[PDB]
Every structure is written in structure tokens, then in C-alpha cells.
């Protein structure tokens, strides 16, 4: 049995990447759900709950500004799949942000694409540590692609036999992440049209 899925499309689930110990990479799947608040809360537990809060607050800024979803009146539940002492997650993890966008919009995410990076409140993907070891974990898991922050491209140093095994996609901003992982369709086209103004503002 595995705790991640490696192919196919699922709503609210993203294959993020993290580190354990100082250096070893892991696949850290995130599952998100949004509910009416019946003020809304970020509902998370465990050692990574602060990263969940960072990611959800940061993605909420972009969701309010560019899509107009009233995420402040939602409860946002973040689940980390897999429990390990010593996990270090990405600040404001883009995997968590992506899972929330998927959950709110009902648009599934490609499970064959892993990702790492930190989401800024403006929508930029900021660089992170451990990118080589995270890519190695994605290869060992049988994933097809890995999204990384563009400023981490020169941090990648793979041995001879991790080379050629995974596609590495550098990104600047969240809308590029979404382009690469959301299932193609009308819903996706509508959502990306809203995030166009984020891209225009940034470039």
C-alpha cells in the first residue's frame, strides 16, 4: 500500500514534497476540504499546522483578490498524509495552496505531478531548501513531473541514474502551477481567466 496516488486526477489532493531529518526527501500528500462555516477557521493539527495556516492565509489573499470566493466564510480543513517525526515542510507550501484552490473550485489535480515551493501573498512561488532530495523522493515514488521554484533550478544535482527520470518544471507564480496540474476543461479555463490579472500585475 502507498499513501500517495501517482496517476489520475483527484479533487483537493496534491503530492507535495518535504524533508525529514536534515536532508532526506519525502512525498507529503495534502488533502484539503472546504465547508461553510455554519467566521471560518483553518482546521489543521500536528507538527505542520503552522505551515498549513501560512499557506491557507496566503492563498486566501489571492483567492479573494482575483477570484472573489468568500473564503473568509469557509472552514478550510488541511490534512497531511503520512505522520513523521522530524518533517520540515515548505513555508506557506504551494502544495497546500493548490489543494485549497482545487477543493474550492472542484477542479481535480494531476496526481502524477509533485511540487515544492512557498506561496507569497502576491501569488509568487518563492524558493525552498532541499530541492534535489525532494526530486529524488518524487522519482523513487514513480511521479512523472515535479514543479519547483525557478530560483531553485541551479540547486538541482542529480546522480547519473536519477537523471532522465522526471520532468522538472520551474515556475514563477501560482497560475503556472495551476496550468500544469489542474485537469483541462471549462472549469479550469474559467478559473485561469480570473488569475490572468495576477500574471499581468506581476510581469
Active site residues: 91, 134
Shortest approach of a second copy to residue 148 CB, angstroms? 10
Nearer to Ca ion, 7 or 167 (CB): 167
Q: Which does 164 bind (CB under 5 to 8 A by kind): Ca ion, a second copy, none?
A: none
Shortest approach of Ca ion to residue 10 CB, angstroms? 24
Applying CB under 8 A, which of residues 6, 24, 121, 156 lies at the interface with a second copy?
A: 121
On whether the CB atoms of residues 120 and 141 are closer than 8 A, the answer is no
Applying CB under 8 A, which of residues 6, 9, 24, 122 lies at the interface with a second copy?
A: 122
Nearer to a second copy, 53 or 187 (CB): 53
DSSP secondary structure string, the chain? --SS--SSEETTEEEEEEEETTTEEEEEEEEEEEEE-----EE--STTHHHHHHHHHHHHHHIIIII---GGGEEEEEEESS--TTEEPPTTBHHHHHHHHHHHHT--EETTEEE--EE-TTSBEEP-S-HHHHHHHHHHTT-SEEEEEGGGGGG----TTTTTSSEEEEESBHHHHHHHHBPPSHHHHHHHHHHHHHHHHH-
x/- contact string, 9-48, with a second copy (CB under 8 A)? --xxx-------xx--------xxx-xxxx--x-xxxx--
Q: How far is CA 129 from the centre of its chain?
A: 15
Return d(Cα 36, Cα 104) in angstroms, integer: 11
x/- contact string, 84-103, with a second copy (CB under 8 A)? -xx-x--xx-----------
Applying CB under 8 A, which of residues 6, 9, 24, 127 lies at the interface with a second copy?
A: 127
On whether the CB atoms of residues 58 and 97 are closer than 8 A, the answer is yes
Q: Which does 28 bind (CB under 5 to 8 A by kind): Ca ion, a second copy, none?
A: none
Distance in Å from the first CA to the final CA of the chain: 44
Report the site for a second copy in 153-192 (rule: CB under 8 A): 154-155
Position 57 contacts a second copy (CB under 8 A): yes
Binding residues vs a second copy (CB under 8 A): 1-3, 11-13, 21-22, 31-33, 35-38, 41, 43-46, 50, 53-54, 57-58, 60-62, 64-65, 68, 70, 72-73, 75, 77-79, 81, 83, 85-86, 88, 91-92, 120-122, 126-128, 149, 151-152, 154-155, 201
Amino acid at each position: 500500500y502507498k499513501l500517495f496516488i501517482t496517476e489520475g486526477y483527484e479533487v483537493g489532493r496534491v503530492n507535495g514534497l518535504a524533508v525529514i531529518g536534515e536532508s532526506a526527501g519525502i512525498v507529503l500528500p495534502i488533502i484539503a476540504e472546504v465547508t461553510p462555516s455554519m467566521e471560518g477557521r483553518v482546521i489543521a493539527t500536528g507538527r505542520l499546522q503552522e505551515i498549513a495556516r501560512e499557506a491557507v492565509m496566503n492563498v486566501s489573499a489571492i483567492i479573494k483578490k482575483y477570484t472573489g470566493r468568500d473564503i473568509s466564510n469557509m472552514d478550510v480543513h488541511i490534512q497531511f498524509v503520512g505522520t513523521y517525526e522530524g518533517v520540515e515542510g515548505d513555508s506557506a507550501s504551494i502544495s497546500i495552496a493548490t489543494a485549497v484552490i482545487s477543493a474550492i473550485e472542484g477542479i481535480p489535480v494531476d496526481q502524477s505531478v509533485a511540487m515544492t515551493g512557498s506561496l507569497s501573498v502576491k501569488g509568487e512561488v518563492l524558493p525552498v531548501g532541499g530541492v534535489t532530495q525532494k526530486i529524488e523522493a518524487a522519482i523513487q515514488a514513480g511521479l512523472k513531473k515535479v514543479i519547483i521554484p525557478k530560483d531553485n533550478i541551479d540547486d538541482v544535482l542529480l546522480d547519473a541514474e536519477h537523471e532522465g527520470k522526471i520532468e522538472v518544471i520551474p515556475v514563477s507564480r501560482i497560475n503556472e502551477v495551476l496550468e500544469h496540474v489542474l485537469e483541462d476543461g471549462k472549469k479550469k479555463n474559467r478559473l485561469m481567466s480570473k488569475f490572468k490579472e495576477l500574471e499581468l500585475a506581476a510581469v
